[PDB]
Each structure stands twice: as structure tokens, then as C-alpha cells.
Structure 1
Amino acid sequence: WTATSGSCKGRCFELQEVGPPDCRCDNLCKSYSSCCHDFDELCLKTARGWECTKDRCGEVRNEENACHCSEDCLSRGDCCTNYQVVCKGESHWVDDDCEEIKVPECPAGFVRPPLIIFSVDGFRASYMKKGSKVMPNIEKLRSCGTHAPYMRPVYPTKTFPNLYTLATGLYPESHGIVGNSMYDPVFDASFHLRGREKFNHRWWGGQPLWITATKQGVRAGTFFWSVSIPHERRILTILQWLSLPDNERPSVYAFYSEQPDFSGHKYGPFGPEMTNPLREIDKTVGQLMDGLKQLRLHRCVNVIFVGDHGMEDVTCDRTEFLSNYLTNVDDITLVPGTLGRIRAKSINNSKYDPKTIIAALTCKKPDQHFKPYMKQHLPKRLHYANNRRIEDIHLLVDRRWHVARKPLDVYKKCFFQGDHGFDNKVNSMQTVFVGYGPTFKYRTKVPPFENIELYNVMCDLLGLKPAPNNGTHGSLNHLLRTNTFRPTMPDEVSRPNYPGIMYLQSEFDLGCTCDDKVNKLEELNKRLHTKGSTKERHLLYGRPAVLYRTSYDILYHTDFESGYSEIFLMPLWTSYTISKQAEVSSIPEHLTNCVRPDVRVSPGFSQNCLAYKNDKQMSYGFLFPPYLSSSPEAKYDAFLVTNMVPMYPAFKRVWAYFQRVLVKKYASERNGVNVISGPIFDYNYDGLRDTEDEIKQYVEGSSIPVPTHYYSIITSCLDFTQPADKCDGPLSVSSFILPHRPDNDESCNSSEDESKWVEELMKMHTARVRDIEHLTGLDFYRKTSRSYSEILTLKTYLHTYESE
């Protein structure tokens, strides 16, 4: 119940929302059908449009008008945005030369530069170049300010997940807005684009920027705008709030535009009809900048121009139907479109079986345009699993396609030509970032970055301490002239042991065998290798720090160094450098099944071969590859029981190709590489390192835990004329987190030679170093000659394998 008989007089676009049944006058009241009776008359004035004209200059103030051209308008803060241009001979902001903003130039009584976020729905990254001729205001922001070529959204690349990620710095799985449509089984309630339930606060987790600001004494404008409020009025409202007295004026504001998304869905991303929406958005930016200029705020405010996601060509005819794969199609509920989520229609149906659904959807048609996954098997870079609102069964849909349950769903709902929602590495889903203002750099291009990072930066721009989030604070310091955040490296929690030779061969009863029963020059030489004489070649960036309490040993060898966990009975990490000149060799016949006890490590803290023999499903591989040994004598080190890890035979096909072929290929292409490899255990799919008591699978009959994933971090010199091991400058990295699966069902062409499918798998499971850090509790690149913020940027880099 709204008692809509109250009034909005003196209350138009009030910042504090009032409680029912009192009627509302805020920028969202329309959306709740809760505005006072006189809201439209008083607060949504339209009379005479949005622009001054020569004939209105110096007019008598008529309070009916949308905006004002009277002499008093500037001090009242309600001039049309083009007032000084039409009536005082000033230039539009866009026509002025760019001039560096070295310091904020603010009116008296401003405590900090305000921040205005100008958010545009569906603004694909390539619009900045492709629409540059029709967007002169945006192009001035872009060229004069700080810009990225693109900004990566989160998955799913839908509106609400991305807007809320912008607000919180959180992955969708953590903030809880995991799609534009959702069912929460704990609440037994649904969230939809239309309707009321989405306004309930229990959907929205973490702490959005407006709440962070308010809690720390920084006033905020309301970020959400009812659809019917025209853009011109949103801009005039922001400019009016900026004219409030010091103790009432917000420091942070957001504008939102439903364009170009709205048109993009109708016409496709580059439909000829798209030119006008882009023009109109530019015009709106121009109104804001002219408005700020009139108020003497154009060299005071920091402006961010940002999108939520891009837009792809998608038509009705590119729909896959689940009714073409499943006989039982009426026993499931599908969330459809550019992703798929499946659950049982009825929780009372005991016959429903996700395994049988997954198998009926796996590699069934030759050009099949979706791939099913249990959510825990999705690429870890998506961070899309740890929420009860994410259904166990997920369909990753190819770009340009839709999935639906039955054909009747698609013609009883062609209309549309654009959509979005796909994997966040897809080029067409990328969006924009420009920062302009005293706190941003001048005429500076920055590399692409993820939208999860922006919350920290917005907090930096406002002098706020961010709530805990998934950004890496400091990784965007290179965007900023000042207000940088200067983090310290986390402290190492566990120091390593450095064991020497402590065990005789006959103390080991591991069931292992090796044909290895085979000189003072080379006896001293190998002792020095065991004490760490080559460690500077193979450990280029320092040893990784262990950020949790555990017991581990550093093990040195000729060709590799490892941090060996006494708790998990395997390395946490193995580090080695392969030069451009390195040779690949085979595993000699006499060593095929060789596993050797490590006399530095107790039998009790070692794996054993008999467990692998007994376990009919599980085999083993090596972290440092025997294929890349520096010499026949050094190769023996690769067969130590301390370099062994559990591997399903299906995974060994992947791993062996990586080790035998791809490492050398990368060393050839990049002028040497340093590789750090290791296991990951994430049985609860939260993206974080499991403790021992979370492990769900062991090698049969043993205490040897089975990894859920294997990582590798492959680092070289960004200047590829310098070898990886003698690099003076910035680094280059690529990483992966491969799922450790007992089949290759994920790869539809896996019956073919590994040269036709392994690399494609590895690209799909590309990762950030930071993702590996979360998953392992390790901190990498501790000892470089580079600035810590630069290393933070490096750790957030994702190699996407998309063309330009």
C-alpha cells in the first residue's frame, strides 16, 4: 500500500528513500508504482525541451520549464546544459582543446573530486573505433583520458550480473546475482527481469559502492534509474545534485543508459540502425560535459565511461533444441538462451539422473553448438559454481547461438538479431573503459583488464577502504595519477625445510622398482646440484611463498626445484627453465616404469607404487618432465617418487603432449620459458585451496590425495629478444588450470591425435596467475626486479587466445 496523496514538492529526486506507506519522490519510485501523485508534474517537467535558444536567453524564470535559460539558472543549478553556449558565447566542451588536468580544479567547499560513472548497456568494445566518427564527445574522453582497448566482463555476460560486479568487485557466484533469471532453492523463490521479487534485498550480496561510501561518511547519489525517466532528466538531476550545499552534496553518482543494448538486440551489433543510438549516447555525454563546464566542474570531476558487456549476432534460426537430444525433455527445467542451466522440473521425481542427461547431451551431433558441463568442471577462469543458485548442469553455448528446450519456446514467446551472455573471453562480449579527470592519467592507454578490478579503483578515487572483494588491489594503479594503493606482499606463513640425505634405500618398501644400479669430478658436481647450485637458473622469480600453515621441503635438482608437501605427499609446485636451445629426449626403455625413492624424504612421507598398481583407474605422471632432462644422468632425478603425481590415463594423454611437445614449442616461440607446475585440490568448487579434510578421493588404499586440477605458469621476457633466464625488463605470462578428469568427454575430437585437440583444451582452461594463487595458497613472483604493482598486473593477466 502506497498512500500516494503525499507530495513531492521540494523533494524531487530525493536521495534518502522514504518508508511505506509514505509516497516516494526518488529516481526508482516509478519502478515500484510508489511515486506521489504529483511526481510527474513537479519532477518530470518537459516544457520547452532540453536546450536553450537565442530567444530564451535571459528570460523570466518560468518554473514549468524542463530547464532554464534565465540569468539566475547557474546559481540555482538548473540551466539547460547548453545555456552558456547559446546565451554567453561559450564553446561546447567537445570543441575545446584537451589540456592536461594535473590537479583537481574544484569550487570552494569540495572535499574531494566527485566521481561520475556513465554506464552504458551493451556497449561493445569495438564501437570505440567503429563508431568514432559519430561519437566525438566519447572520443575526446577516450583520447584525452586513460583508456583500455577493452574491458572483460564477468560470466554470464548479462546485464545484472555485470552491473552488480561493477558495484561490488565480486564474481557473480559471490554477490549472488548469477543471471538475469534465477531460482534460489533455500528461499524457494525466483528472480526475474520483470516483476517484483528482484527488489527483495536477500538476492543482492556483498557491499556495493554506494553502501561502502555511505558507511564511511561519503554521500552517494542513487545509482538505479526508472526506465521512463528520460536521459536528459537523469543528467540534469546529477547536475542539480552537484549544486547542493557541501554537507548535502554526494561525492559519487551514476548515470545509466539502456542503449545501445536495447537496439542491439533488435538490429544486431552493427545493424545500420545502430548509428543513431550511438549518436544519441554521445549527445548525452556532451550534455553532461557542457553541464559540468558551466558549473566549473569539468576539471574537478573524475568521469568513468563503462559498459556492462558487448553484443553478438544471434538469430532464431541458430537455436539448438534439447528436444532433439533428450527423450525426457518434460522432466527438466531449462534456463535458456546464450547459456543453459538445467535442473529437475520436480524434486519429487526420483528417476531424474544428471549423469544420463549429461551423456545424452555430449558430442551427439557433429557441429553441436553447445557443450554440457557439471558446473564444477567449467573452466575455473569463469568462477561460476559456488552458489546454490547455479544449477549443477550447465551448458556453454557457442557464440552466435541459443539453446532452448523445445521449438515451441522460440516461435511462441524471427524478431531479434543480437544477444549476449556467452563466455566472457569472447571478443564480441568485451566492453569499454575510459577514465577522465584529475585522478586519471593523461592521454594514456592501459592494457585490457577485468571489470572485477574497478570497485577497488572507484574506492581509491573516493578515499574509501574497499570491502573484501575479488579485485587485486594495486593491479590498476597504472590507471591513476595519484591515490594509488600501495600494497605489501603477503607474509610467508610456513617456512620450508631443506632436507639432506637422511634415508637408506632399503628403508623404503614402496613397491617401486627402477633399473638404476649403474668418479670424483662428477660426484662433487651432483652434490652441489642437490644443494641448489642451478637454483638461480630454474627458480627465476624467487621461491613461491606458502601462505598457510603446513610442513614442506624444498628439493633441489640439476634441472628443477620443488616445494614438496609432507601432508599431500607431492609437490605444491615444481619450477624449471627450458631455454630456446633445449633438446627433447625420450624416456629410455630401461626407465619406462622406473620410480626411485628420494633419500631426502622419509618413506612415511612418500607415495608408493603399489597403491597405483592396485588402483585400476589411477596411474601417475611427473611434474618435471623426463623428456626435458639436460643429460642422461640428470634424467634419473625426474623419476624420483617426490616428482610423481596421480594421473588418470585419459589425463596423461593431455599432460604428456603438453610436456613432450608444447613446452619446447613455447620455449622456441618465446625465447626460453620458465615453467611452474603443480596440483590443485578444489573438491568444494569455491576457487580456494582445500584443506586436507576436504579431499574426496585418494589413490586406492593410500593417503595419496587426488588433485582436481593441474596448473602451469609459463613465464618469459616480454622483450622476446632477451632469453627468459636473462630478462632485464617486464615479464610475459600464460597459465592454465586443467581439469584432472578420468575421460576426455569434454573434447569431442579426442579419438584423434593429441595435435588436433589438446591445445584447444588448454586454451579453454587458460587462467590468471591470481586464479592459481587462490587455488593453492601460494604467492608467486616474490623476487623480481619489477615494481609490486606491475607484478600485480601480471598476476591478473589472462591470455585469451582470441584474435585482435
Structure 2
Amino acid sequence: TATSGSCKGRCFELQEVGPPDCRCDNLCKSYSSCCHDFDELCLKTARGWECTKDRCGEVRNEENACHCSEDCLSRGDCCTNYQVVCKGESHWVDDDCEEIKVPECPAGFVRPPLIIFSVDGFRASYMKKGSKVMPNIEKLRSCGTHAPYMRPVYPTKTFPNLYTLATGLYPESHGIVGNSMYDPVFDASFHLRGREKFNHRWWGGQPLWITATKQGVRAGTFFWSVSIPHERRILTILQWLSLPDNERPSVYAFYSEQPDFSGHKYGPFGPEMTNPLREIDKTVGQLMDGLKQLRLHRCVNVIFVGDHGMEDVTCDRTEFLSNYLTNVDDITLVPGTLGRIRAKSINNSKYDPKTIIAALTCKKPDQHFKPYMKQHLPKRLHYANNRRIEDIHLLVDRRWHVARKPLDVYKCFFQGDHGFDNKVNSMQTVFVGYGPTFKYRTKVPPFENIELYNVMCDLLGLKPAPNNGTHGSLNHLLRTNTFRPTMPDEVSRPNYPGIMYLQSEFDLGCTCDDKVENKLEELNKRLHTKGSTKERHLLYGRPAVLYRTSYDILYHTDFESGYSEIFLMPLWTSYTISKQAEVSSIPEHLTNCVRPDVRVSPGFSQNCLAYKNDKQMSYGFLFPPYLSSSPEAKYDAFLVTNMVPMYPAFKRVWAYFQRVLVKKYASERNGVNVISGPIFDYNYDGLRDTEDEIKQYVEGSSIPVPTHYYSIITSCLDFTQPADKCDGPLSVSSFILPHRPDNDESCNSSEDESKWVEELMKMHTARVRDIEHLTGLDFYRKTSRSYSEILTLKTYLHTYESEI
């Protein structure tokens, strides 16, 4: 190699140098390529970090870590408390907050800088619970914009979350799917320790610093060597902000390994945790006093953001694959707060994932982890579409670990850990935004960390790279946006078929006992088929179809559907169930009733014979017969165009939802509007499948089998108003249930539906936005709400955790 040359006047230089030369940037330590004099010139420590009364007006001495001399301000290198100790100034924390209506920047600043202050393991409840010891953070929080918590991404580990913050992408798309990974195409392994993580090939997407660079905005570094202490990181950022206009970056990052580092040792609320929270707050204080000195404290936007929280976890709460598997040695486990399993050797053709899962399913009474094939994980986790994510996964219960065998845990160190399902309260983390671009004293609802990349791009005037945020859904955070989104254009307009077919044209092998026979009640049934009740059942406009297809709008007394001539079933079925609505049962004579739809050709219909011949597959209905508004209207629910294929095991789930839960939600929420439909995602990419991607059909037919069924359940946020007459904001909960031929996922399934079904639905809670990706549909096109507010609503997730 080559080291010689000097960091003289180059400490923490922003552009990298090429060999021959030794490096003086904050990455050099990691390449053992710093110049011989790096520590000496760049990592000065003499006299510590604060001005004292006597150092005031001192003679500049270049060996000091920071300066209290008369020239320090313009040299850009005073200690952060200089003006307080020597010029009678006040600490930023002691000043009242004053609204920052416009940026107040020094001449030459083209745009307010962004500083991202990122804290590791900063659990959401530390904001309330540590508030006495964190006065600077608490001023940021209460004078700026803050959420009660921010939802990390799964796994709730450091690398997936930091890189998701930086890219707006799910780990499956960015590639950093855990703190440890194996990539079979590379044949390589990635870890926290080691040089492997420095290779380019792991890091997908386009993180904020690159977005910035490519578009002409300069960035400080987003990597700090572990041995550079926090005080020096702050001084380096402050120095960079004193650079000349042509050289000065616009976006900066600070990172603290605390409080995570302590949390692992002592638990989230260990008595030892007070100090690290004091010490982070003191750092924030140094940055803010430093900004105030440079007259930048009403100019810079500051983001205080965590990557994940921290949970109580101990060695005795470890489940061992050795208590379940006899073939334990033929597998590799990525262990801990999640499990990922693959074959130890791919020259082993006796390795069977099928039997591995079976041996891990529902085996002990209080079993603290649950196996899944990755494509069967809740769709809200978005954790399947990457060759680095193993087919077998274990979702581990909060407070537990999974290990391969006892030797692995002993050959108790720790009291805290994180990595669990990102809905878990103890995994939630923080967000505060403070500055001219953020709002003043404003609380916003919790949101997902995938949304921030768009906002940081807005804050810096950048166009974001394509990402998983929904741009506009966080506009309510900002005093001025620059992003006004517009509704996507409908691609396919519907047909509106009338009565075009006689009953005898159909040979579907279907039967119904419906031959049971007046211009009042026959002009009425005509009007219902023309959409006379459509304002009742279709409350927010019809969904828009965002891809090219052929489909028909079908109207009925009790429901409206968008029926796909390609997939031979509805894409969406819309209906409203008022608080007053009544549950009836299906009359005996109509148990097996399926009726041809005279609006839709035999050639674009399902048939009953296929369901008869298919021994695995049965069928269900999207608008539930149980909720029909009259005995005559019920006939509408048995139309072949309301049928969808369903495994008998799944009919147990679906029947309970339709018979029991919809009515329950209607009475609790004062009416609900329900939109239900099928989802096809056979390649588990989270995106609607094209017809040529379907792997399963009802036997001997072209009726495709859904991988999932969704419902979107909307009511009035002010529940004193009924769902069909709501004048203000809406409230939504949704789900994406896996369409599975067994109920192995639910260990209590041999019991009554009242003991397990709702728990399954809760697990498979979803955002309307997840359902849009999966169906190519766009919901809520006609409301009186602003589009920004609708976007927020579409990104909402009902989590079913208790309060924070």
C-alpha cells in the first residue's frame, strides 16, 4: 500500500483522494489508510470540549480541540459554548421558542441546510419517560413538529432501518435485509463486524447523499468512524458549515450508537439508561448552541430521528431449534429476534423445507416463535422479494430469542434487544422536525419511516428517486411543501352491461331454487340494476383501474362491483352496512344456489362444475348473503358474478368475518362501507400479477385462484355521524388475508372462530396503499377531503397494539 503525505489543512476533507495518497476523511480509519498524522492534526483533544472563564480572549493555540480565542468565530472553530462563557450569551435551550416563519440565513445560503441527527435504539416512549433529563430534545420536540412515534421497517435492526431512512425503500428492495446476510448469486456473507459490508454490491437504491450529489447539492459524510467522539462529530459539522458557499454542503448527518449500546446491556428502562439519555441531550445542546453562534439556528432544518426502539430480552427466553428438530445440523440459522433458515449444504437433496416447517408448527403450548414460508408472512412487512431473504422465516414473539441449540447461547450477557415485528410498541421510535420548513408546535399522527426520504428530498429541493413512500402523505408536516401530488389517471374505463343473455345460454352446471314469482316492485328492481342505490354503497367514487383491462360495473340493491372479464370475478365489491342493518341467515332452499348473471356472457363467467370437479377448492361470495337487505335482494348475492374461489379452510375465516365481524364493526363505528376483493401475488413482489403470472386455477378451468383476499373498511372519524352521511375526515382499517388451504398459521384453529379468526385478521392488518400496489386500483377518488389528507389516510395502518 501507500501512506506518506499529511492531513495538514485537510482534516475531514469532503472529496476522497485517490492512491498514491493517504486519506484524511472520516472513512480513512476503516481502510487503514489515514495519513500518519491524522490523529495528531485531525483528532485533537487538548483542553477538552468547553470554554472556561479564563480561556476567554486567549491566544490561539492550534493544539486545542476547540478554541476560545477572539478569532475563533470567523475561523469556524470555537468550542460550542464559547459565546455563552465569554460573550454573556444564553444557551439555545434557555431561550423561549419563537416561531420561525421564514428562513433567517447568512448571505450566500441558497437554501436552508438539513441536519439529520440520528439516534440508535431511541424507543418512542423515551420522549415522555426521559423528558426530565432531555431539555434540548424536549424543546425541539415541543417547538417543532413531532409524531408520538415513527414506525420502523422489519427487521427492526440498524442497517435495514438506517438505509430505509436514507432511500425510502423497503429492505427487500434496497437489499439490506438484516444486520447479517448471505447472497447466493454472489456466494457471499455480510456482517456487522468485517470488511464485507464495505463492498458496493450490497447497497441498492439511491440513498439521500447520492440523490443530493447527482442533482448539485453537496453532502457532508454519512459515515462516522466509531472512535471519533461525538463532540468532534459536532465540531466537524459546525466547521463544514463555515466553509465558503461554493464548498459548503447542504445536507449533513450525525449518528449516535447510544442509547442502543447501553440498552442491550441494561434493558430499555434499566437505571443505567438515564446517563446515555442525558449525554445525547447534551450533544443536541452543543449542536444548537453551535448553530446559534453561527447565526444558523433559525436557518437550519433539524431532524431528530431514531432507527428502532428496544425491548426487554434475556438468555433464559431463548427457544432452541434443537428441541424441535432432529436434523438440526443440516441447517443454518440466522438467530436472535427473528429467524432465517436455509440448508447448510445445497448438495443435500434430502433437505426438505416442507418437513422443517411442519416440525416447527404449533409444537409446544406457549411456543414463542412461528414459522412461515416468506411469501406467507403478513403482507404489511413487505419481507419476501429478495434472494437474500431465506424461504423459511421465524417471527419471534417480543421478549424472546430463537437459537439453533444451547451451545450457541453459552459458548447472561444482555438485557435488551430489538428486531421484532415492526408493529410492536417497544420497537417504535421517534421523529421531530424543527426549522423554518417544518411547522411550529404541531403534533402529527404516527407515520412510517419509508415516508421521510421524499420529505428530506422536498426540504432540499430535490426530485426523489423512485421509492416506497407515498409522496404528499407527509405534507401536513411542512410549512411550505413544493410537492402537490395529483391523482393517477384511470387507464381502463368500465363497461355498463344491460340485460343481454337468456338463462338457457348458460351451461355452468349451476342450479338455484329461484323459480318463485305488479309494476311497482318490477320498476324498482330495474332501477337497482341501473344504480339507483349506488350513492349508498359507493361512498367515495368507484376505484380507478390503473392498468389496461376489460371489466364491467355491476349494480345491485345492496352492493356494486367492478367485474373483471379477464379474471372472471370482481376486482372490487363495494357495500355499506349501517348501524341499524340486520344479519339474516341463508334460507335452506338457497344453500347451493348459484345463478347466472344475464348481464355477462357465459364465456366470461365462472362455472359450478369446475368447483364440483376440484376436490381442493370451494367458493365464497364477496358481498355476503347474510347481509342482504330483503329476502328478494338476497338473490343478487348468489349471482355467479359475486362468486370467488375459496379453500374450505379459508371459508371458515371468511364466513366469520362476513357473518359476525362486519355487523360488529358497523355497530361499533356507526355504519361501515366495505370494499372487498381478490389479490394475486404469486411472485410475492407486493405488486398486482398479470394473468400470465398465475400459478393456480380451479381445476379444469381458467378461473384463477387468489393468493389473498382484502377488505377496506371505512367509516366517519367523528363516529356520531353515520358512515353514509359523514361531513369530515374518515377512519379506515384494512387487511390482506392469505388465502391458505389450511389454518396451520393459527394454533387454536380447531376451536370456534370466535377464539382465533379476529386474531388472524389483526395479524394481517394492511394500509389501503398496500392494497393499491397489489390490485392496480386507486381508492377514494371522490370525497370532499383534500388529496393530501387522503394520501395520509391511505398510508394509515391500524396496528391493534394498546397505547404508548
Pairwise TM-score range, normalised by the shorter structure: over 0.9
Which segments of 5 or more consecutive residues in structure 2 lack a partner in the other structure? none
- Displacement after TM superposition at 1:10 (Å): 1.2
Tell me whether 1:538 sits opposite 2:537 in the alignment: yes
Deviations 1:495-530 (A, max 9, x none): 000000000000000000000001210100010000
Distance 2:587 2:172 in 1: 48
- Displacement after TM superposition at 1:169 (Å): 0.2
Distance 2:486 2:684 in 1: 28
Deviations 1:648-680 (A, max 9, x none): 000000000000000000000000000000000
Deviations 1:57-79 (A, max 9, x none): 01100000000000100001100
SS at match of 1:633: coil
Distance 2:595 2:34 in 1: 77
- Displacement after TM superposition at 1:277 (Å): 0.1
Which segments of 5 or more consecutive residues in structure 1 lack a partner in the other structure? none
- Given that 1:474 and 1:484 are in contact with CA atoms closer than 8 Å, whether structure 2 keeps it comes out as no
Deviations 1:128-187 (A, max 9, x none): 000000000000000000000000000000000000000000000000000000000000
- Given that 1:456 and 1:473 are in contact with CA atoms closer than 8 Å, whether structure 2 keeps it comes out as yes
SS at match of 2:305: strand
Deviations 1:507-562 (A, max 9, x none): 00000000000121010001000000000000000000000000000000000000
Deviations 1:366-402 (A, max 9, x none): 0000000000000000000000000000000000000
- Given that 1:496 and 1:554 are in contact with CA atoms closer than 8 Å, whether structure 2 keeps it comes out as yes
SS at match of 2:461: coil
SS at match of 2:265: helix
SS at match of 1:74: helix
TM-score (norm 2): 0.99
Distance 1:563 1:569 in 2: 11
Distance 1:44 1:104 in 2: 33
- Given that 1:336 and 1:402 are in contact with CA atoms closer than 8 Å, whether structure 2 keeps it comes out as yes
Change (3 A) 1:662 1:21: farther
- Displacement after TM superposition at 1:304 (Å): 0.1
SS at match of 2:189: strand
In structure 2, the partner of 1:608 is: 607
In structure 2, the partner of 1:728 is: 727
TM-score (norm 1): 0.99
Deviations 1:165-221 (A, max 9, x none): 000000000000000000000000000000101000100000000000000000001
Give me the identity figure in percent: 100
- Displacement after TM superposition at 1:29 (Å): 1.2
Distance 2:231 2:730 in 1: 47
- Of stretches 20-29 and 249-258 in structure 1, the one that deviates more from structure 2 is 20-29
The residue correspondences of 1:262-277 to structure 2 (distance < 5 A) are 262-277=261-276
Distance 1:440 1:671 in 2: 36
- Given that 1:477 and 1:484 are in contact with CA atoms closer than 8 Å, whether structure 2 keeps it comes out as no
Deviations 1:746-783 (A, max 9, x none): 00000000000000000000000000000000000000
Deviations 1:215-246 (A, max 9, x none): 00000011110100000000000000000000
- Displacement after TM superposition at 1:20 (Å): 3.5
In structure 2, the partner of 1:365 is: 364
Change (3 A) 1:771 1:368: same
Distance 2:320 2:175 in 1: 28
SS at match of 1:762: helix
SS at match of 2:257: strand
- Given that 1:322 and 1:404 are in contact with CA atoms closer than 8 Å, whether structure 2 keeps it comes out as yes
Tell me whether 1:457 sits opposite 2:455 in the alignment: yes
SS at match of 2:123: coil
1:489 to 487, 490, 506: 487
SS at match of 1:737: strand
Tell me whether 1:96 sits opposite 2:101 in the alignment: no
Deviations 1:612-670 (A, max 9, x none): 00000000000000000000000000000000000000000000000000000000000
Deviations 1:422-446 (A, max 9, x none): 0000000000000000000000000
Distance 2:749 2:396 in 1: 20
Distance 1:314 1:477 in 2: 37
**Cα RMSD between the aligned structures?**
0.5
Deviations 1:344-379 (A, max 9, x none): 000000100000000000000000000000000000
Deviations 1:75-121 (A, max 9, x none): 01100000000000000000000100000000000000000000000
- Displacement after TM superposition at 1:7 (Å): 1.2
SS at match of 2:799: coil
In structure 2, the partner of 1:516 is: 514
- Displacement after TM superposition at 1:30 (Å): 1.1
Distance 2:597 2:770 in 1: 31
- Displacement after TM superposition at 1:22 (Å): 2.2
- Given that 1:614 and 1:700 are in contact with CA atoms closer than 8 Å, whether structure 2 keeps it comes out as yes
SS at match of 2:652: helix
SS at match of 2:724: helix
Distance 2:427 2:555 in 1: 45
Distance 1:21 1:744 in 2: 63
SS at match of 1:264: helix
- Displacement after TM superposition at 1:19 (Å): 2.7
Distance 2:348 2:489 in 1: 51
Distance 2:27 2:667 in 1: 58
Distance 1:745 1:732 in 2: 32
Distance 1:17 1:712 in 2: 52
SS at match of 1:572: strand
Distance 1:698 1:741 in 2: 14
- Displacement after TM superposition at 1:21 (Å): 4.6
SS at match of 2:629: coil
Distance 1:395 1:423 in 2: 11
Distance 1:36 1:689 in 2: 54
SS at match of 1:688: coil
SS at match of 2:584: coil
- Displacement after TM superposition at 1:457 (Å): 0.2
- Of stretches 482-491 and 251-260 in structure 1, the one that deviates more from structure 2 is 482-491
SS at match of 2:17: coil
SS at match of 2:678: strand
Distance 1:472 1:201 in 2: 28
Change (3 A) 1:21 1:172: farther
Distance 1:646 1:18 in 2: 63
Deviations 1:309-333 (A, max 9, x none): 0000000000000000000000000
Tell me whether 1:699 sits opposite 2:698 in the alignment: yes
SS at match of 1:52: coil
Distance 1:483 1:330 in 2: 56
- Of stretches 7-16 and 433-442 in structure 1, the one that deviates more from structure 2 is 7-16
Deviations 1:675-709 (A, max 9, x none): 00000000000000000000000000000000000
SS at match of 1:320: strand
- Of stretches 481-490 and 92-101 in structure 1, the one that deviates more from structure 2 is 481-490
- Given that 1:153 and 1:430 are in contact with CA atoms closer than 8 Å, whether structure 2 keeps it comes out as yes
Change (3 A) 1:269 1:35: same
- Given that 1:370 and 1:397 are in contact with CA atoms closer than 8 Å, whether structure 2 keeps it comes out as yes
SS at match of 1:266: helix
- Displacement after TM superposition at 1:28 (Å): 1.6
Distance 1:447 1:4 in 2: 52
- Displacement after TM superposition at 1:18 (Å): 2.0
- Displacement after TM superposition at 1:483 (Å): 2.3
SS at match of 1:725: coil
SS at match of 1:150: strand
SS at match of 1:183: strand
- Displacement after TM superposition at 1:6 (Å): 2.0
SS at match of 1:341: strand
Distance 2:628 2:246 in 1: 69
Distance 2:265 2:50 in 1: 30
Distance 2:246 2:329 in 1: 59
- Given that 1:124 and 1:429 are in contact with CA atoms closer than 8 Å, whether structure 2 keeps it comes out as yes
- Given that 1:340 and 1:397 are in contact with CA atoms closer than 8 Å, whether structure 2 keeps it comes out as yes
Deviations 1:453-497 (A, max 9, x none): 000000000000000000000000000000241011000000000
- Displacement after TM superposition at 1:32 (Å): 2.1
Distance 1:687 1:33 in 2: 42
